[PDB]
C-alpha cells in the first residue's frame, strides 16, 4: 500500500517529534528543487514555509503530522506537473500568457479581479511566476477554498465570523 510506503518515507523526513516543522519543510523542499534546476526559484523561504505549515496545520499542533504532510505533498506533485506542463517556453517559470491556463488545469476558475490581485501578490514584474511562488500561492488558494467550505456548514455560500475567529483564520496563515 502506497500510504504505508509513504509512512515509511515520512519517518525519515519528520523531526524528532515525528511531525514536520516549517524549518524541516523548508529544508526538504529546497533539497528537492535543487535537483530540479529546470524549476526556477530563489528557494522556499522560511516565512513562506511557516505560512504553508500554518494553513495546513488543521489540528493546530504547530507542525505537519503525517496526514497533513501527505496531503500537502500530493498537491505539490500534482501542481508541479502542471507547472512543467505550462512552461511552454521552458523558461523555468510560467509566463503570464500560460498562468491562466495553469490555474485552470489545477482546477481553479477565478474571477478576473481576484486573478489580478493574485498575480500582483505572487508574480514578478513580467507577470510571470516562479516555482516556490506558484506552489505557495496554490497551497494557500487551495487552503482558503477548503477553509471557506468547511466554515459554511449550512451550505449557503456565505460564512459569518466574529473578531476572534477572523484573527485566528488570518493570523495563523
Amino acid at each position: 500500500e502506497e500510504v504505508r510506503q509513504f509512512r515509511r518515507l515520512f519517518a525519515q523526513l519528520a523531526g524528532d517529534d515525528m511531525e514536520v516543522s516549517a524549518t524541516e519543510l523548508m529544508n526538504i523542499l529546497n533539497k528537492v528543487v535543487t535537483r530540479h534546476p529546470d524549476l526556477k526559484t530563489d528557494g522556499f523561504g522560511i516565512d513562506t514555509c511557516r505560512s504553508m505549515v500554518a494553513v495546513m496545520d488543521s489540528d493546530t499542533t504547530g507542525k505537519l503530522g503525517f496526514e497533513e504532510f501527505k496531503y500537502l505533498w500530493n498537491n505539490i506533485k500534482k501542481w508541479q506537473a502542471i507547472y512543467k506542463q505550462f512552461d511552454v517556453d521552458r523558461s523555468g517559470t510560467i509566463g503570464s500568457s500560460e498562468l491562466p491556463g495553469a490555474f485552470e488545469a489545477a482546477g481553479f476558475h477565478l474571477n478576473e479581479h481576484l486573478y489580478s490581485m493574485i498575480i500582483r501578490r505572487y508574480s514578478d514584474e513580467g507577470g510571470n511566476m516562479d516555482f516556490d511562488n506558484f506552489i505557495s500561492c496554490l497551497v494557500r488558494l487551495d487552503a482558503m477554498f477548503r477553509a471557506f467550505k468547511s466554515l459554511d456548514k449550512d451550505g449557503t455560500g456565505q460564512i459569518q465570523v466574529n473578531i476572534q475567529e477572523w484573527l485566528q483564520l488570518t493570523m495563523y496563515s
Binding site: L9, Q12, L13, I28, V32, W73, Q80
Partner: peptide, 11 residues
C-alpha cells in the same frame, strides 16, 4: 534518500 523518493515524484 527519502529526498530521492520525493524528488522522483516530480514529473
Amino acid at each position: 534518500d527519502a529526498i530521492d523518493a520525493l524528488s522522483s515524484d516530480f514529473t
